[PDB]
């Protein structure tokens, strides 16, 4: 009963285009395929904009004011968005492939590099009401005879330097009156000109060619004309210049090459400040910070985005996205971290708060099919198409054990006992479930009974029963633990593809080929529910289909399903353009999401395989925090969250309940009534206001008197608020009073508070415990020095 919205894209940082630093220099804007992602370097946070282009992004630019962001795809279709409010402003089609877009430093105008044509336009006023036809073109310029590589602005918004493949660097004047000042074409280079820049005084013009030659241009008497006073050459053995940028204030030259290295130089002395190698793949894009101390670099082949602090030779940001599509994902039990697996065979660990890759694992040779955590969370397990199952310790980040079958069985699914002592995997070729022992590393036994490939596996969290699903049209319930082993088969209408186990461990839902999510009672082994999915699923006709989408039967089933931790919802996904969120007890569609809107993805709308990318979700799990869910797709990890909470959902509201009345109760010192009335309104700002304004003395009195119905909601509020809040001692005192006063009620009903309790332990374990660890170490680091005798 919550509204989920797209928040950020994980597993993925950069594809192509030009990286742009925010004017403040504390944020980095990177185009991510069909969307654009922003990374907060100072705060170590990231978000991906909700708006989506028709095709992949080609060029972007942010104005110095930080209010207007312009993005253009490969078709020339531009999207203007308010950077601050993250809302789209206007949609325009330039009807041409725009190589580069750059705002004027004054901000009134922005220039477009279009083929051999330079277009200069007027920037709309954000303060004005949303205008229907705000784009008016200031002028259009064309002297080049070939495509423009790039353009550069003068610091004074009066002249533009443009470089093309005509082996010429050429200048304009933004003002018609000032045309006589700057109407020169600079020549001399032997290959394509990559970048033309002004000096800080603008007296000098530096032009760089693809061959690796930098020409210094100065006005001089031979009466006065531009001449090349100095020539510098980059003596790269074969590397060609790929991208160049310049910072007039500090005189820094950053050049990215095709060989995958870059060099930093101080002009006009041509002093090599530093040379490092970015890899074997070309350095596609380069940018400089406003201050000039941070350098952002980008290579398209491996999805590469790096930020370098050349001052201290330190790395601000260093993150890689998956080369292939992510095949599976798994959350940590607390939800602080998420692990992703790709078809390459590499596993990556990602931090939800920062959104950055903490670690990567390269041990698996082939594609990693499934990833899962133990209940405790210290250990992680993964299965791969190399024929091995590997266990990972995520405190020291080591593969402490590896598992494999006798004949190298190919594994596609994996399940782990809650005790973390038994691991079971399934295969498409063997029809058998291999069982191992975690501690010893041997094959305990093979669970036989399926006449078809095992499609999915899962251990009940509480009861520890194993439920297995297979294309053999049935589901088998294994009581492996105990003196005697029993198997209870429940036959199913059609081929089962995915399986989800209730956190209670009392029920199991399964998605079948017919497009049905059937829910069975584990103890009684009888059906209790069923939901139709055929109609709700959205599948787009692929470009090569000779049969219509409505008649098509390619994918109207869900290949992945998971439960909500509360237990009343199912999120389902498959080889389609839809994620559907259903409600289990009453069997409807709560809401549906469109995973992508790019035409280049096939499903959005004789010896050679016609073979192109398709839109799909491989796996979808709920966040244990019960505020977000992640979907693994080709583009990357799409995390949809409920954080904004703009919606108004009062609970048990009455006429007497009002925000003003709640404040009046606070002024009258009726803290208990104010807190209850605020929670009835369900407004976070009012829920927050009452929360601090109560004194510490009155906390135990209020906590003991909270109604039981509001208890789970206050505990959830504290846990999510405390994770990022600064009032550690204040928030803890609430956790003391609530647990002390209502702790017995929590024990009686563990599952009602399961999510709220978990959020609390995350706060106290991941930040509160760390603070005391430093505090005690300083206390002990204190004591040794004073008591110990000083050296002679």
């Amino acid at each position: 009963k919550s509204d989920f919205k797209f928040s950020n894209l994980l597993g993925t940082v950069y594809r192509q285009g030009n990286i742009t630093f925010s004017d403040d220099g504390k944020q980095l804007l990177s185009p991510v395929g069909n969307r654009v992602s922003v990374f907060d370097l100072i705060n170590n946070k990231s978000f991906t904009f909700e708006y989506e282009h028709r095709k992949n992004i080609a060029a972007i630019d942010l104005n110095k004011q930080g209010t207007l962001l312009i993005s253009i795809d490969e078709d020339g279709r531009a999207i203007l968005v308010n950077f601050k409010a993250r809302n789209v402003l206007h949609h325009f089609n330039f009807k041409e492939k725009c190589s580069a877009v750059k705002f004027s430093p004054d901000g009134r105008l922005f220039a477009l590099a279009s083929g051999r044509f330079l277009q200069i336009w007027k920037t709309p006023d954000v303060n004005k009401d949303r205008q229907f036809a705000p784009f008016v073109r200031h002028r259009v310029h064309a002297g080049h005879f070939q495509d423009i590589t790039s353009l550069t602005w003068s610091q004074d918004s009066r002249f533009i330097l443009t470089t093309s493949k005509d082996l010429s660097a050429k200048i304009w004047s933004v003002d018609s009156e000032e045309k006589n000042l700057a109407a020169t074409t600079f020549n001399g280079h032997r290959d394509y000109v990559m970048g033309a820049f002004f000096s800080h005084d603008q007296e000098k013009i530096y032009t760089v060619s693809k061959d690796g030659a930098v020409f210094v241009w100065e006005f001089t008497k031979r009466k006065y004309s531009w001449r090349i006073t100095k020539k510098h050459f980059f003596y790269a053995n074969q590397a060609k210049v790929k991208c160049v940028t310049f910072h007039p204030a500090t005189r820094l030259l950053a050049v990215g090459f095709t060989s995958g290295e870059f060099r930093l130089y101080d002009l006009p002395d041509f002093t090599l400040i530093q040379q490092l190698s970015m890899g074997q793949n070309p350095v596609n894009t380069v940018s400089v910070n406003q201050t000039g101390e941070w350098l952002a670099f980008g290579s398209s082949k491996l999805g590469q985005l790096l930020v370098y602090e050349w001052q201290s030779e330190s790395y601000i940001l260093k993150q890689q996205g998956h080369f292939d599509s992510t095949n599976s994902l798994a959350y940590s039990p607390d939800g602080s971290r998420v692990v992703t697996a790709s078809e390459d065979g590499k596993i990556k660990v990602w931090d939800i708060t920062s959104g950055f890759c903490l670690a990567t694992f390269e041990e698996h040779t082939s594609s990693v099919t499934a990833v899962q955590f133990a209940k405790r969370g210290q250990v992680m397990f993964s299965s791969s198409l190399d024929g091995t199952v590997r266990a990972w310790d995520l405190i020291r980040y080591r593969n402490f054990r590896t598992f494999t079958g006798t004949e190298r069985i190919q594994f596609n699914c994996l399940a782990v006992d809650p005790s973390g002592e038994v691991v079971c995997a399934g295969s498409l070729d063997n029809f058998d479930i291999h069982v191992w022992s975690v501690q010893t590393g041997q094959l305990l036994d093979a669970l036989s009974g399926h006449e078809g490939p095992v499609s999915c596996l899962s251990f009940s969290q509480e009861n520890s029963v194993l439920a297995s699903a297979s294309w053999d049209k049935t589901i088998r319930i294994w009581s492996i633990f105990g003196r005697s082993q029993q198997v209870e088969p429940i036959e199913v209408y059609s081929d089962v593809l995915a399986l989800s186990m209730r956190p209670d461990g009392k029920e199991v839902a399964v998605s079948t080929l017919k497009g049905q999510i059937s829910i069975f009672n584990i103890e009684d082994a009888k059906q209790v529910g069923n939901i139709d999915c055929r109609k709700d699923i959205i599948s787009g006709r692929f470009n090569q289909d000779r049969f219509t989408a409505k008649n098509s039967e390619r994918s109207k089933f869900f290949t992945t399903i998971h439960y909500s931790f509360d237990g009343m919802a199912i999120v389902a996904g498959g080889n389609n353009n839809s994620i559907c969120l259903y409600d289990v007890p009453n069997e409807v569609l709560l809401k549906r999401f469109i995973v992508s809107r790019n035409m280049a993805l096939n499903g959005t709308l004789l010896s050679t395989r016609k073979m192109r990318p398709e839109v799909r979700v491989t796996s979808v799990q709920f966040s244990p925090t019960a505020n977000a869910f992640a979907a693994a797709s080709t583009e990357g990890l799409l995390i949809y969250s409920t954080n904004d909470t703009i919606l108004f959902d009062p609970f048990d509201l009455d006429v007497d309940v009002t925000p003003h009345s709640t404040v009046e109760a606070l002024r009258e010192k009726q803290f208990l009534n104010a807190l209850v009335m605020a929670f009835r309104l369900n407004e976070e700002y009012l829920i927050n206001k009452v929360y601090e304004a109560i004194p510490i003395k009155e906390i135990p009195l209020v906590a003991s008197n909270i109604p039981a119905i509001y208890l789970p909601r206050i505990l959830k509020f504290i846990g999510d608020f405390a994770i990022e809040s600064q009032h550690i001692e204040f928030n803890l005192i609430w956790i003391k009073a609530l647990l002390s006063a209502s702790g017995g009620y929590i024990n009686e009903h563990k599952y009602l508070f399961s999510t709220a309790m978990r959020s609390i332990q995350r706060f106290i374990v991941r930040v509160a415990k760390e603070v005391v660890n430093t505090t005690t170490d300083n206390k002990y680091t204190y004591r040794f020095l004073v008591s110990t005798d000083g050296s002679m």
Partner: peptide, 16 residues
Amino acid sequence: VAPTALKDDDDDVLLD
């Protein structure tokens, strides 16, 4: 000026 324009030496010899 260009049209696009805006608008002691310490000796290194030391004894040892």
